[PDB]
Design an enzyme around this catalytic site. Sequence first.
Site, PDB file in Angstrom:
ATOM      1  CG  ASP A   1      -1.934  -0.943   1.050  1.00 52.42           C
ATOM      2  OD1 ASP A   1      -2.238  -1.602   0.207  1.00 52.42           O
ATOM      3  OD2 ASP A   1      -2.537  -1.297   2.361  1.00 52.42           O
TER       4      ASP A   1
ATOM      5  CG  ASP B   1      16.430  -6.459  20.492  1.00 54.76           C
ATOM      6  OD1 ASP B   1      16.927  -7.321  21.233  1.00 54.76           O
ATOM      7  OD2 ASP B   1      17.117  -5.178  20.665  1.00 54.76           O
TER       8      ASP B   1
ATOM      9  CG  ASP C   1       1.420 -14.883  15.559  1.00 54.61           C
ATOM     10  OD1 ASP C   1       0.247 -15.156  15.020  1.00 54.61           O
ATOM     11  OD2 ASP C   1       1.725 -13.951  15.598  1.00 54.61           O
TER      12      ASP C   1
ATOM     13  N   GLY D   1      -8.561 -11.110   7.844  1.00 53.63           N
ATOM     14  CA  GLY D   1      -9.101 -10.717   6.474  1.00 53.63           C
ATOM     15  C   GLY D   1      -9.472  -9.105   6.654  1.00 53.63           C
TER      16      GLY D   1
ATOM     17  CG  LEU E   1      -8.303  -9.393  14.901  1.00 58.11           C
ATOM     18  CD1 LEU E   1      -7.858 -10.936  14.744  1.00 58.11           C
ATOM     19  CD2 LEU E   1      -8.387  -8.859  16.565  1.00 58.11           C
TER      20      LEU E   1
ATOM     21  N   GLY F   1       8.859 -12.160  21.400  1.00 50.84           N
ATOM     22  CA  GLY F   1       8.827 -10.983  22.368  1.00 50.84           C
ATOM     23  C   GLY F   1       9.084  -9.724  21.658  1.00 50.84           C
TER      24      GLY F   1
ATOM     25  CG  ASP G   1       9.190 -10.317  16.852  1.00 46.83           C
ATOM     26  OD1 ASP G   1      10.327 -10.034  17.647  1.00 46.83           O
ATOM     27  OD2 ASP G   1       9.311 -11.534  16.321  1.00 46.83           O
TER      28      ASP G   1
ATOM     29  CG  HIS H   1      -1.922   0.821  20.087  1.00 42.60           C
ATOM     30  ND1 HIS H   1      -2.734   1.141  20.942  1.00 42.60           N
ATOM     31  CD2 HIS H   1      -1.906  -0.459  20.052  1.00 42.60           C
ATOM     32  CE1 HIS H   1      -3.226   0.188  21.655  1.00 42.60           C
ATOM     33  NE2 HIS H   1      -2.755  -0.819  21.185  1.00 42.60           N
ATOM     34  CD  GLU H   2      -0.261  -3.282  17.913  1.00 45.29           C
ATOM     35  OE1 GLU H   2      -0.186  -4.193  18.510  1.00 45.29           O
ATOM     36  OE2 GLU H   2      -1.630  -3.195  17.619  1.00 45.29           O
TER      37      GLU H   2
ATOM     38  CG  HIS I   1       0.855  -3.573  23.096  1.00 48.09           C
ATOM     39  ND1 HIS I   1       0.231  -3.305  24.165  1.00 48.09           N
ATOM     40  CD2 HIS I   1      -0.200  -3.633  22.097  1.00 48.09           C
ATOM     41  CE1 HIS I   1      -1.080  -3.015  23.928  1.00 48.09           C
ATOM     42  NE2 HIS I   1      -1.351  -3.168  22.616  1.00 48.09           N
TER      43      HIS I   1
ATOM     44  CG  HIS J   1      -5.019  -2.385  25.171  1.00 48.80           C
ATOM     45  ND1 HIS J   1      -5.358  -3.594  24.938  1.00 48.80           N
ATOM     46  CD2 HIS J   1      -4.398  -1.875  24.441  1.00 48.80           C
ATOM     47  CE1 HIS J   1      -4.932  -4.047  23.643  1.00 48.80           C
ATOM     48  NE2 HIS J   1      -4.241  -2.878  23.282  1.00 48.80           N
TER      49      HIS J   1
ATOM     50  CG  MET K   1      -0.185   2.558  25.272  1.00 52.87           C
ATOM     51  SD  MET K   1       0.513   1.882  23.952  1.00 52.87           S
ATOM     52  CE  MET K   1      -0.105   0.125  23.928  1.00 52.87           C
TER      53      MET K   1
END
Length: 167
Positions: free
Chosen positions: A25, A59, A71, A77, A81, A93, A95, A119-120, A123, A129, A137
Amino acid sequence: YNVFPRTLKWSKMNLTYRIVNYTPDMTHSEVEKAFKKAFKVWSDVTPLNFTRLHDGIADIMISFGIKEHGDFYPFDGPSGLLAHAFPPGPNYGGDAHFDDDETWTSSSKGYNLFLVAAHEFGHSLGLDHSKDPGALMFPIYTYTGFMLPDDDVQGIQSLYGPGDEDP
Ligand SMILES: c1ccc(Nc2nc(CSc3nnc[nH]3)cs2)cc1
Ligand SMILES: [Ca+2]
Ligand SMILES: [Ca+2]
Ligand code: NA
Ligand SMILES: [Zn+2]
Ligand SMILES: [Zn+2]
């Protein structure tokens, strides 16, 4: 002897990341800029340093995938999510994975990659959150046309300290 840390976090301030693959994209440059800016959100308010690797083991391994992608968190789709990231630790860890059935952008259209990545990466660094609807978050996407909200500053600094308070 050493007991384990009381809170989950990286035990080092120098972290590496690798962009393993790229979404259709956006250009490679747009993707790189979005991730660089997303890391800067967090490094600006801590002593953390982020260095990009082109290959090998970093890392924070970053990738775009669809459906089952290696995972316990398969994507679903279009819509639903969008992405997920793993807390600090070995292997997966840290990723961060982005659903390539979404439309990723550097604009207000689709999902803004910078904002979702910021945001990710929270984590990836050890934040879960927040209940503040205005926090980065907070667990639902909103577009903002960047200032890290105070709740996120307090959270990340609780883990890593502030670094230089006036850089
Ligand atoms: C800006 C950008 C994103 C957010 N917040 C977001 N929340 C979610 C869903 S919650 C979740 N976290 N990992 C997997 N699913 C996805 S982007 C808030 C402000
Ligand atoms: Ca999806
Ligand atoms: Ca990792
Ligand atoms: Na896509
Ligand atoms: Zn995944
Ligand atoms: Zn989240």
